[PDB]
Amino acid sequence: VMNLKQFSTYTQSRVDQYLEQQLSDYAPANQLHNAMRYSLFGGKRIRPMLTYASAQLVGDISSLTDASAAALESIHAYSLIHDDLPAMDNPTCHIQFDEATAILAGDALQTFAFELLSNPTSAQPELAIKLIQELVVASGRNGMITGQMIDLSSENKNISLAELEQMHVHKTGALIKASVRMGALSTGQVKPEQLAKLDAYAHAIGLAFQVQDDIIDLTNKATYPKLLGLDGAKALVVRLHEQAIAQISEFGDKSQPLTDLANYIID
Least distance in angstroms from the C-beta of 126 to Cl ion: 7
| Residue 177 phi, psi (nearest 5) | -65, -40
Using rule CB under 8 A, residue 126 touches its own copies: yes
Binding-site partner at residue 153 among its own copies, Cl ion, none, CB < 5 to 8 Å by type: its own copies
Indicate the residue among 79 and 212 with the shorter CB distance to its own copies: 79
Near its own copies in 139-158, by CB under 8 A: 139-142, 145-146, 148-150, 152-153
Q: How far is CA 193 from the centre of its chain?
A: 22
CB 195 within 8 A of CB 132: no
Least distance in angstroms from the C-beta of 62 to Cl ion: 12
Using rule CB under 5 A, residue 128 touches Cl ion: yes
CB 230 within 8 A of CB 218: yes
Least distance in angstroms from the C-beta of 38 to its own copies: 14
**CB under 5 A: which stretch of 7-15, 37-45, 119-127, 183-191 binds Cl ion?**
119-127
C-alpha 182/C-alpha 46 separation (Å) is 14
Using rule CB under 5 A, residue 132 touches Cl ion: no
Q: Which residues, including other chains, have CB under 8 Å from residue 30's CB and lie 6 or more apart?
A: none
Cα 210 to Cα 35, 234, 243, 265: the distances in Å are: 29, 12, 16, 10
Positions that interact with Cl ion (CB under 5 A): 121, 125, 128
